[PDB]
Swiss-Prot record, chains A, B:
Keywords: ATP-binding, Cell cycle, Cell division, Cell membrane, Cell projection, Cilium, Cilium biogenesis/degradation, Cytoplasm, Cytoskeleton, Isopeptide bond, Kinase, Membrane, Microtubule, Mitosis, Nucleotide-binding, Phosphoprotein, Proto-oncogene, Serine/threonine-protein kinase, Transferase, Ubl conjugation. It is found in: Cytoplasm, Cytoskeleton, Microtubule organizing center, Centrosome; Cytoplasm, Cytoskeleton, Spindle pole; Cytoplasm, Cytoskeleton, Microtubule organizing center, Centrosome, Centriole; Cell projection, Neuron projection. The active site is at residue 129. It catalyses: L-seryl-[protein] + ATP = O-phospho-L-seryl-[protein] + ADP + H(+); L-threonyl-[protein] + ATP = O-phospho-L-threonyl-[protein] + ADP + H(+). Mitotic serine/threonine kinase that contributes to the regulation of cell cycle progression. Associates with the centrosome and the spindle microtubules during mitosis and plays a critical role in various mitotic events including the establishment of mitotic spindle, centrosome duplication, centrosome separation as well as maturation, chromosomal alignment, spindle assembly checkpoint, and cytokinesis. Required for normal spindle positioning during mitosis and for the localization of NUMA1 and DCTN1 to the cell cortex during metaphase. Required for initial activation of CDK1 at centrosomes. Activation of CDK1, appears to be an upstream event of AURKA activation. Phosphatase inhibitor-2 (PPP1R2) and TPX2 act also as activators. Inactivated by the G2 checkpoint. Inhibited by GADD45A and p53/TP53, and through dephosphorylation by protein phosphatase type 1 (PP1). MLN8054 is also a potent and selective inhibitor. Activated during the early phase of cilia disassembly in the presence of CIMAP3. Inhibited by the small molecule inhibitor VX-680. This is Aurora kinase A. The chain holds residues 119 to 379 of 395 of the full protein. Disruption phenotype: Death at the blastocyst stage due to mitotic defects and failure of cell proliferation. Detected in embryonic neurons in dorsal root ganglia and brain cortex (at protein level). Highly expressed in testis, in about one third of the seminiferous tubules. Expression is restricted to specific spermatocytes nearing completion of prophase, with levels falling off on transition to elongated spermatids. Highly expressed in the ovary, expression in the oocyte starts around the transition to large growing follicle. Abundant expression is seen in the proliferating granulosa and thecal cells of the growing follicle, and in the young corpus luteum. It is an enzyme of class 2 (transferase). There is a cross-link at residue 131 (Glycyl lysine isopeptide (Lys-Gly) (interchain with G-Cter in SUMO2)). It comes from Mus musculus (Mouse). The modification Phosphothreonine is found at residues 151-152. Residues 6-247 form the Protein kinase domain. The gene is Aurka.
Length: 252, 252
């Protein structure tokens, strides 16, 4: 592929995903999204080799709940990612529209998330920040993970390994917590620990301090509570999420 | 123990370790360090329960290369940690004094670090930020770990689990990298990826880009290079560090 193979259209995502444009392959008329990375920025971050490893892996994967990387190319000053276009926008936008999701829509999204996250773990696909703004919606309204772009909270910079500075610390156990947070936010309309200040949000997470509105049913409460465990080893596994009674009863 | 059991002396560590004072137990005249934590701060951080778990574990441990927690107590507004006093200051101060350490001193410190870190892993002791400022020196010049006090580099706050916000992500593999960085800094006088800007330091870590001065011997180069692996699973284990030829040849 070359730049000249594409007509470049309107920018996508208001810069939240970097320089991304709606695009069309000129000969086939196929609609896709093209992400433009500047080599000077990649070089200054030291991420060229890590990016190569990741896109190599992604370009060989297919899964209905992971945003697809069709391929990639480069020129003298840029690297170009050829991405699946998700026509229905982000889950964030949908939640903004509806205020909150019903039990069917939520259980279906959680199944799809669990399936995507399982597949990422088995195929060693790095993902970085699971939240509604990073979740896209396909033609049939199926959820697609898109969280691939990239003193500290991990300690002092000079002493930190590449996996910390490259955002590669979301392992299976971390993801279980994320899934609990997402299940709550889908049903309620806001994540469980949200507060006006960062300090207060910090406090609430550490204390695992949250409340369920009355409209949240017993089954949904059981799921969420079993995911949001302070002790990582105690969290309900992805396999166990897929077999949870509430998930079985409600997922499309 | 109660506050009235202690004479409180000069502040220690210039606030880098919080409110810490040289102290003496009044009846025995024993010299120690007393750390004062304000309950209002603990409450606002949401760390009361996590602190309890950690000090409970620590107060039952003894190891020559881990700073000892003798015990703890509280009153209406404060929690007090009764700590071992390390009379010879920090490894940072010593490195500042000498500019760099010889192979004997370095190998001995690395053995001691490896032993401390191994013991922490086996007894499930959390430690948070391995660097020379957090390493203290005992009466006989033995090294003692003291790194126990506490958009982000890990992602978006509302979606992060307690282990990320509580600084509990330094596992065995992370520690291997830290040990490589420390070995280099002991021998050279600065950590391998140090740069004027955070961005340039970031770049150097991700690229694993560093150079050895001429005075660094083949054996030390082999050790350091085998620890500083981009791929976490490839790093030399703590057991393998203790059996490395350079360590065997040089450690006191
Ligand atoms: C497989 O998707 C990716 C794969 C990789 C990377 C990436 O940047 N990797 C990376 C880049 C530099 C350094 C380190 C990692 C990014 C994405 N994805 C994206 O950036 C999403 C673009 S927004 C969008 N896309 C389609 N349809 C929509 N409606 C929207 Br809105
Ligand atoms: C076993 O050592 C600790 C155990 C625990 C904590 C701690 O704060 N935990 C904690 C507090 C709040 C929230 C979460 C964790 C801190 C330390 N240690 C320290 O603070 C070191 C004090 S400086 C010093 N000490 C002795 N001799 C010297 N020459 C110096 Br200088």
């Amino acid at each position: 592929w070359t730049l000249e193979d594409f007509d470049i259209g309107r920018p996508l995502g208001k810069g939240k995903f970097g320089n991304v444009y709606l695009a069309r392959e000129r000969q086939s008329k196929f609609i896709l999204a093209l992400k433009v990375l500047f080599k000077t920025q990649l070089e200054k971050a030291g991420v060229e080799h890590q990016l190569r490893r990741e896109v190599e892996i992604q370009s060989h994967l297919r899964h209905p709940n992971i945003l697809r990387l069709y391929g990639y190319f480069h020129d003298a000053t840029r690297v170009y990612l050829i991405l699946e276009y998700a026509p229905l926008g982000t889950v964030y936008r949908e939640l903004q529209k509806l205020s909150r999701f019903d039990e069917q829509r939520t259980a279906t999204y959680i199944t799809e998330l669990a399936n995507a996250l399982s597949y990422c773990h088995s195929k060693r696909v790095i993902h970085r920040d699971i939240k509604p703004e990073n979740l896209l919606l396909g033609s049939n309204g199926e959820l697609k993970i898109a969280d691939f772009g990239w003193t500290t909270l991990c300690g002092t910079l000079d002493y930190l390994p590449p996996e910390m500075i490259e955002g590669r610390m979301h392992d299976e156990k971390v993801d279980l917590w994320s899934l609990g947070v997402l299940c709550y936010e889908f049903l309620v309309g806001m994540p469980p620990f949200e507060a006006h200040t960062y300090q207060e949000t910090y406090r609430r997470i550490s204390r695992v301090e949250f409340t369920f509105p009355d409209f949240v049913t017993e089954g949904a409460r059981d799921l969420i509570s079993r995911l949001l465990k302070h002790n990582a080893s105690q969290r309900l596994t992805l396999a166990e999420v897929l077999e949870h009674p509430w998930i079985k009863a409600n997922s499309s």
